[PDB]
Amino acid sequence: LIPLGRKIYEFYNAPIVKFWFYTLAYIGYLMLFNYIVLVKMERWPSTQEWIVISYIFTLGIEKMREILMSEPGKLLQKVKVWLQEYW
Amino acid sequence: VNKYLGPYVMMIGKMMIDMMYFVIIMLVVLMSFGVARQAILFPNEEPS
Ligand SMILES: CC(C)CCC[C@@H](C)[C@H]1CC[C@H]2[C@@H]3CC=C4C[C@@H](OC(=O)CCC(=O)O)CC[C@]4(C)[C@H]3CC[C@]12C
Ligand SMILES: CC(C)CCC[C@@H](C)[C@H]1CC[C@H]2[C@@H]3CC=C4C[C@@H](OC(=O)CCC(=O)O)CC[C@]4(C)[C@H]3CC[C@]12C
Ligand SMILES: CC(C)CCC[C@@H](C)[C@H]1CC[C@H]2[C@@H]3CC=C4C[C@@H](OC(=O)CCC(=O)O)CC[C@]4(C)[C@H]3CC[C@]12C
Ligand SMILES: CC(C)CCC[C@@H](C)[C@H]1CC[C@H]2[C@@H]3CC=C4C[C@@H](OC(=O)CCC(=O)O)CC[C@]4(C)[C@H]3CC[C@]12C
Numbered sequence: 229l230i231p232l233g234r235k236i237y238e239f240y241n242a243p244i245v246k247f248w249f250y251t252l253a254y255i256g257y258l259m260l261f262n263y264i265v266l267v268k269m270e271r272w273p274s275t276q277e278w279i280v281i282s283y284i285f286t287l288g289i290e291k292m293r294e295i296l297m298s299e300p301g302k303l304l305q306k307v308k309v310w311l312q313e314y315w
Numbered sequence: 316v317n318k319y320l321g322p323y324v325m326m327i328g329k330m331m332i333d334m335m336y337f338v339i340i341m342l343v344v345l346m347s348f349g350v351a352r353q354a355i356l357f358p359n360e361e362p363s
């Protein structure tokens with residue numbers, strides 16, 4: 229069972245696997261956003277809109293975490309390094 | 316079989332790959348405009 233867990237940990241930490249996991253989550257987020265903008269919405273958001281809202285909030289938390297875990301040490305320099313990537 | 320039409324046909328077959336990449340970029344821009352237009356102009360729609 230230890231080689232199986234080692235294979236799972238080695239697979240899921242590969243950069244290509246992480247990129248394709250993030251991409252297949254993006255292409256399942258975009259369809260949910262398409263569904264919530266095409267169909268009408270009620271007074272409260274539906275399940276798919278809650279998933280889209282959760283994706284946006286966790287992505288925003290991830291972008292603040294990329295601001296914090298950067299290369300410089302002073303906050304303005306961290307933001308200035310992060311703003312070079314326009315995307 | 317013809318000496319001019321034959322190279323023309325495989326030339327078309329070679330430009331199909333560049334055509335496919337143009338189709339991919341046009342597809343992204345096309346569904347972005349289509350989804351935005353349909354989602355703005357038709358707010359109350361059932362799943363169909
Ligand atoms: C990994 C990538 C390439 C694909 C992952 C995304 C799909 C598996 C998701 C994204 C959009 C989803 C759809 C979005 C909306 C709906 C409507 C939903 O219907 C309702 O909410 C009303 C009727 C009911 O309750 O069944 C049923 C699921 C469905 C078809 C979803 C099925 C699963 C889909 C296709
Ligand atoms: C992680 C995200 C970005 C992509 C992963 C895709 C799936 C995990 C999601 C996408 C669409 C989701 C579906 C969207 C809507 C519905 C309808 C929903 O129907 C009901 O709850 C019926 C009763 C009610 O209306 O309350 C059941 C869950 C389901 C199938 C969802 C199951 C999970 C799905 C397939
Ligand atoms: C009535 C409507 C549906 C128009 C039909 C459009 C397509 C079904 C046709 C139009 C032009 C055709 C292409 C014209 C030329 C070629 C080159 C030829 O390929 C070769 O000679 C092989 C070598 C090479 O690919 O360079 C046959 C396939 C292809 C891509 C054809 C594939 C089918 C295409 C895209
Ligand atoms: C980015 C570019 C290069 C490609 C993207 C365009 C196509 C994928 C789209 C454009 C026109 C679309 C078609 C427009 C109209 C119809 C008729 C539609 O049939 C009906 O609505 C039934 C008859 C009716 O209700 O009137 C089925 C989908 C289809 C073939 C669509 C299929 C998808 C098409 C070919």
Ligand SMILES: CC(C)CCC[C@@H](C)[C@H]1CC[C@H]2[C@@H]3CC=C4C[C@@H](OC(=O)CCC(=O)O)CC[C@]4(C)[C@H]3CC[C@]12C
Pocket residue numbers: 255258259260262263266362363
């Ligand atoms: C990254 C790009 C390529 C994503 C593009 C995704 C959209 C073009 C797809 C993905 C989710 C699709 C929706 C998933 C579920 C439905 C419900 C479906 O409802 C029914 O079939 C009626 C249900 C019934 O009464 O049985 C109508 C199509 C629709 C809105 C789909 C329309 C097309 C959507 C928005």
Ligand SMILES: CCC1(c2ccccc2)C(=O)NCNC1=O
Pocket residue numbers: 247250251254287
């Ligand atoms: C929101 C898009 C994305 C992404 C996904 C795949 C490739 C590149 C970027 C993400 O889903 N999270 C991390 N950063 C991002 O901007």
